[PDB]
């Protein structure tokens, strides 16, 4: 029954239980294999098992297309270490080793249980006939497509080889299809289903972007008597969660321009808010020194342009403030995301200025025209503008903040529990909005 999967999990993968109860649900649908399934789970190790364990208990051959071999090799090495018959087709392994595997597949009852191919090969006239015989011999049990987003021009890593993977699914009617990606706008997910030719019902397992501890709010730079003071206060607010504890935690601040980043560090530092500046304009030596201090809470605060780069996400990041709007809503999610990794209460804040908005507006406009002369008009050109327009909408339009993030991304509405500005005090929101109506010009 389900008893099968439980035993195989601990017997082969040496895991007492599934990491996430979502994982459990996902894997079970793949094991049923009644349904094409889609998994937008993150870099957390959960997604792989969702096609790995089913592949074993399938009693047929489990192909897995993966775009770069870096990713493949990591797993195949660990898979082997768990006494599994797995085989990678990467241009990396020799023109002779390749002839040995092509052969194995062609004979019936082949040794290969799991073939990690690359998209490139999977499409080429070179690989097609061995493929054909696997299908006809009803040897193909699952066709997995990792980094699916690659199928959609909206996704950054568009890989047209992946478009042939769609006509391939229709040819392999008997074999089910499992697509996976870390993150996907519903826009992207809708392209996936279509260009990959999935069979409805597709069963979907998408981790929600909403997180309990994160208290999101928006302020407007037009409407602050002392903009630096509000920030000082907000940094003090988020830090020192326990009065008897004094200073507790650390936090981050973001800045489109290098220069403005430096400015803010000093403003805060003078004000008692002990804070350091950090950008790509600096030499690397500077950065690793600064990061150290922040990492050890020598300096409880840092200020980092659009270039901190998740070097580490630290446990007790109590706050993340954006002095300016980030370049994309996604951008805001990721950036804010670095906060509150430890699950204890944390604050995310955006400081919105129509001044900022129009600054970034012509930035992206001019560097898009810069690529249009370089390439031409393209699907993804409009997408860049849109990705940012969503963040402007997030601040300008009143609404529970976690839900606006969930909408852009494609989660259902989350349970805020009085955990954002619009949810906590619907009215103070109305107040400051109708404020920016007047302070529009």
């Amino acid at each position, epitope marked *: 029954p389900e008893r099968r999967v439980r035993s195989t999990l601990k017997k082969v993968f040496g895991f007492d239980s599934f990491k996430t109860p*979502l994982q459990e*649900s996902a894997t079970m649908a793949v094991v049923k294999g009644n349904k094409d399934v*889609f998994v937008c789970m993150p870099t957390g190790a959960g997604k792989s098992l969702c096609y790995q364990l089913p592949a074993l208990l399938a009693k047929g051959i489990t192909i897995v297309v993966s775009p770069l071999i870096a990713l493949i090799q990591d797993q195949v090495d660990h898979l082997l270490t768990l006494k599994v018959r797995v085989s990678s087709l990467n241009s990396k392994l020799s023109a002779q080793e390749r002839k040995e595997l092509l052969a194995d597949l062609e004979r019936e009852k082949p040794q290969t249980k799991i073939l990690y191919i690359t998209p490139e090969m999977a499409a080429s006239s070179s690989f097609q006939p061995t493929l054909n015989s696997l299908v006809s011999r009803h040897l193909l049990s699952y066709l997995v497509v990792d980094e699916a987003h690659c199928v959609s021009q909206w996704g950054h890593d568009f890989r047209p080889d992946y478009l042939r993977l769609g006509a391939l699914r229709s040819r392999l009617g008997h074999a089910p299809c499992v697509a996976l990606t870390a993150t996907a706008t*519903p826009q992207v*997910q*809708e392209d996936v*289903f279509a260009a990959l030719h*999935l069979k*409805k*019902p*597709v*069963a*979907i*397992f*998408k*981790t*929600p972007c909403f997180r309990a501890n994160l208290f999101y709010d928006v302020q407007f730079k037009e409407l602050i008597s002392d903009p630096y003071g509000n920030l000082k206060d907000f940094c003090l607010k988020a830090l020192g969660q326990e009065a008897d504890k004094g200073l507790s935690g650390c936090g981050i601040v973001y800045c489109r321009t290098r220069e403005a980043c430096e400015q803010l560090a000093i403003e805060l530092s003078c004000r008692g808010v002990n804070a350091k500046a950090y950008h790509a304009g600096l030499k690397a030596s500077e950065r690793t020194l600064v990061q150290n201090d922040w990492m050890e809470e020598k300096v409880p605060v840092i200020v980092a342009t659009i270039s901190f780069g998740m070097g580490v996400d630290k446990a007790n990041v109590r706050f993340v403030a954006h002095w300016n709007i980030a370049k994309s809503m996604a951008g805001y999610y990721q950036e804010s995301g670095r906060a509150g990794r430890d699950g204890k209460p944390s604050w995310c804040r955006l400081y919105y200025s129509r001044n900022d908005r129009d600054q970034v507006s012509f930035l992206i406009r001019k560097e898009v025209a810069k690529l249009q002369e370089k390439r031409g008009n393209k699907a993804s050109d409009k997408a860049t503008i849109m990705a940012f327009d969503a963040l402007v909408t997030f601040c300008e339009e009143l609404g529970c903040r976690h839900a606006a993030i969930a909408k852009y991304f*494609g*989660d*259902a*509405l*989350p*349970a805020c529990a009085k955990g954002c500005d619009h949810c906590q005090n619907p009215t103070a929101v109305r107040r400051r909005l109708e404020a920016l109506e007047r302070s529009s010009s």
Partner: nanobody
Amino acid sequence: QVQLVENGGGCVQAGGSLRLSCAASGSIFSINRMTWYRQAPGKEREWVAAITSGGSTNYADSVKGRFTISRDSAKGTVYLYMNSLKPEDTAVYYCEAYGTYTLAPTGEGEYDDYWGQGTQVTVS
């Protein structure tokens, strides 16, 4: 799973008027295209009209002027106003829920097509 349930048909005279309701229950997120199909017994199943999620809409040539669909985007439910009715239009009316992305907070969801039962429309 999802429920598409129809309402608001009956009988009426030549040149008359009715309004038809299509109601999707459950944990929906979005529906690519919702379409009204009429089954005239003794005839070909006929495409009536349809509304994309984005508010774009399209009508059959025969019913162009006379019919009009709409979403109470909020109510999560769409309507077909059928005025200047003719004997022609006598049929069972159902909707196709194409591209029905359904999802929950647990993260567990499905992309599916859903069909409604239909409601009965008779015109002198």
